[PDB]
Design a protein around this ligand. Sequence first.
Ligand SMILES: *[C@@H]1O[C@H](CO)[C@@H](O)[C@H](O)[C@H]1O
Ligand SMILES: *C1O[C@@H](C)[C@@H](O)[C@@H](O)[C@@H]1O
Ligand SMILES: [Ca+2]
Ligand SMILES: [Ca+2]
Ligand SMILES: [Ca+2]
Ligand SMILES: [Ca+2]
Ligand SMILES: [Ca+2]
Ligand SMILES: [Ca+2]
Ligand SMILES: [Cl-]
Ligand SMILES: [Cl-]
Ligand SMILES: [Cl-]
Ligand SMILES: [Mg+2]
Ligand SMILES: [Mg+2]
Ligand code: NA
Ligand SMILES: [Zn+2]
Ligand SMILES: [Zn+2]
Lengths: 142, 191, 254
Amino acid sequence: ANAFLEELRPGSLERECKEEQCSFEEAREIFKDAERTKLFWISYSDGDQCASSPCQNGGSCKDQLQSYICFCLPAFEGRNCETHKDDQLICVNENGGCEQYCSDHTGTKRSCRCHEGYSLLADGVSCTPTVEYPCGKIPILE
Amino acid sequence: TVAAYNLTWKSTNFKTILEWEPKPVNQVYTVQISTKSGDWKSKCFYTTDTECDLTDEIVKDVKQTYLARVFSYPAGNGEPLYENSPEFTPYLETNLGQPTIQSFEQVGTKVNVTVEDERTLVRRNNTFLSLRDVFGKDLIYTLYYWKTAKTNTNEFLIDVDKGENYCFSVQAVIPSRTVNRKSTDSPVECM
Amino acid sequence: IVGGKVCPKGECPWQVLLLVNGAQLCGGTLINTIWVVSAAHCFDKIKNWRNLIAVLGEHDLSEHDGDEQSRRVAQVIIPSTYVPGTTNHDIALLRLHQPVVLTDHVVPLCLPERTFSERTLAFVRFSLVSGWGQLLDRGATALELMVLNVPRLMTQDCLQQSRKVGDSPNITEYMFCAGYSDGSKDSCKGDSGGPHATHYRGTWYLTGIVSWGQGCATVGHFGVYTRVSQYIEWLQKLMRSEPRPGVLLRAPFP
Ligand SMILES: *[C@@H]1O[C@H](CO)[C@@H](O)[C@H](O)[C@H]1O
Ligand SMILES: *C1O[C@@H](C)[C@@H](O)[C@@H](O)[C@@H]1O
Ligand SMILES: [Ca+2]
Ligand SMILES: [Ca+2]
Ligand SMILES: [Ca+2]
Ligand SMILES: [Ca+2]
Ligand SMILES: [Ca+2]
Ligand SMILES: [Ca+2]
Ligand SMILES: [Cl-]
Ligand SMILES: [Cl-]
Ligand SMILES: [Cl-]
Ligand SMILES: [Mg+2]
Ligand SMILES: [Mg+2]
Ligand code: NA
Ligand SMILES: [Zn+2]
Ligand SMILES: [Zn+2]
C-alpha cells in the first residue's frame, strides 16, 4: 500500500505489517506461498476479540479465533463472569444451603426450617434433635 | 411451551457452555447437569438466555462424563417438559485453545521457540492450571517452521541455518484422540 | 426384592410387616407411632378387616426376638379415587389401635413437605427399597429383610427406555419409575407399600411406595412407584381426623 518515499526499500513485514497495516498481497508477496500466508493471515486478520472487554466483575479475557475466553474471579461465573454466585441463594439451588426445609423470601434471604423432631442450630441452616427417637435416623449405627 | 432442541456443548480449555434453541416465548429455563450415577445439580435459574455455563461443575473432575437437560417452564412459575443432551466427557471433548509463541531465542546454531503456557479453567489452589498440568504426558506442542517439530514441553530446540532468519507457528495437540486432536494454529512470528 | 442384599438388623427400622390372619400380606412404612403408610392394592382381597396385624421390629421371619412389636390396625384410609384391580392412586394410611414404642430397632421415616420433596428429594439419584417379597419373578419369598439401591427417573425417560407393551397402564403424575431395565434388580410382589426412602443431609425421608410394575427385574422395564409427594396434604389432614366407624374408610381425594 502506497506511501511515496517510504516504498523505496524492499519488503520487510516488521515495517509493512508489524508497524503498519499489512494488505493481503503485501503478505502473499513477503511469504510467496499462499499457505505460508495462510498461517499468518488467518490470525493477522482475525482481531483481538477481547477489545470490548467482555469479562465483567474483574475477569481476564484471553483471545482466540473469532472468540475469547473469560477467566472468572471466584464468586462469579458465566461466559463473561456476569453471574454472581452470592445472589443465587434460592431453594431451587441445592436447597438454599438448608439441611432440612427451605423457604424463599425473594426480596430478602431464604429461611431454613426443620422437621417435627428437630430444631434449628446456631447457624440458621442446620437441624438438631429434640425428641429421643427422631424420624429418618438409624440408632444402631451410631 | 416447547421442548428445547439442538443442544451443543461449546468447550475450549475447560470453559464449557451448553447452549440450545429456541429463543423463549413465555418460557424460562433451568439447567440440570449430573454425572451418570449421581445427583442432578441445578444451574441457570429461569433464564431467558438460550445458553448455560456448566464450567464450574465439570472442572470438579474433568474425566467424568456429564449429562444435562434443559427444563421448559411457563411464565408465572406433574413433571416439566425437557430435553436431554449428549454425554460429555470433557478431557476427551474440550477443545485446545490457540497457542501463542511467547519468545524464541537464537542460541547460536539452534533456536529455542518457547510456547506460552495455556491456562485452563481448572482453578486449582487459587491460580488456574495450564493444559500441561491437566493433560500432562498426553499433551504435545507441535511447531511448523520455514519444516516440522514436536515437543513434550513448551519449547522446541531446532537446528537452524546461519544468517537465514526463519518463521514460526505452533499447535496444541493431544495425539491419542481420534477426533478433536489439534487446536487452531498460532499467530506466525519470524526472526 | 430381586438382586438386593440383606438389611442388617436395625438398619431399615420403619419397615412394617403387614399381616392378615397370621399370613404374610404386604409391607409398609411407620411414619410416626400410630400411623403407617402402605399400598391400596394390598387390601383388594380382604374380607376380615378386624384381623389385620402390623409388626414393627421384624428382621427374620422364621424366628422371634424381643425387638418385635405386633399392633393391630384400627383404620385403613384409602383415597376414593382408587379402583381395585387397577394401579392408580395406590396409597393407604393405617391407624394403629395402640401406639408402637420407639426403640433402636423401631424408628419412624419422615414424611416431607410437597415442595422440598418435589424440588429437592426428587433429584437425589439413588434411594433404597425394602421388603420380604419374591426374590425372583414367580418365586420364593424372603425370611430376612432384603434392601436395594435404585436410581430414580423422570417419566419421559421412563417411557422412552421402556420396551412397549400395549396392555400396560399409564405412568401418571401419581407414580414414578426407578431401577435397572437391564433385568438385574427390581422390587417384586410381596414388597408393596414398602418404603422407597431417600437420604438427604443426614435424614431419611419418604418419597415412594412399591406400587406396580411389569414382572420383576424385567428387561426393558422399570419398577413403578407412588409419588408420596402428591398425597402430603391429604395424609396430613387425615392424621388429624377423629376416628371413624369400621376399619375401612374411603377418604376423598383431592
Ligand atoms: C466485544 O464487544 C462486542 C460489542 O461491544 C461484542 O459483540 C463481543 O462479543 C465482545 O467480545
Ligand atoms: C484475570 O484473571 C483472574 C483469575 C484474576 O487474577 C484477575 O485479577 C485477572 O485480571
Ligand atoms: Ca511510513
Ligand atoms: Ca508501506
Ligand atoms: Ca503488491
Ligand atoms: Ca511485497
Ligand atoms: Ca482474535
Ligand atoms: Ca421374627
Ligand atoms: Cl501449556
Ligand atoms: Cl394394639
Ligand atoms: Cl410384578
Ligand atoms: Mg518495527
Ligand atoms: Mg507493503
Ligand atoms: Na427391570
Ligand atoms: Zn430387629
Ligand atoms: Zn410376631
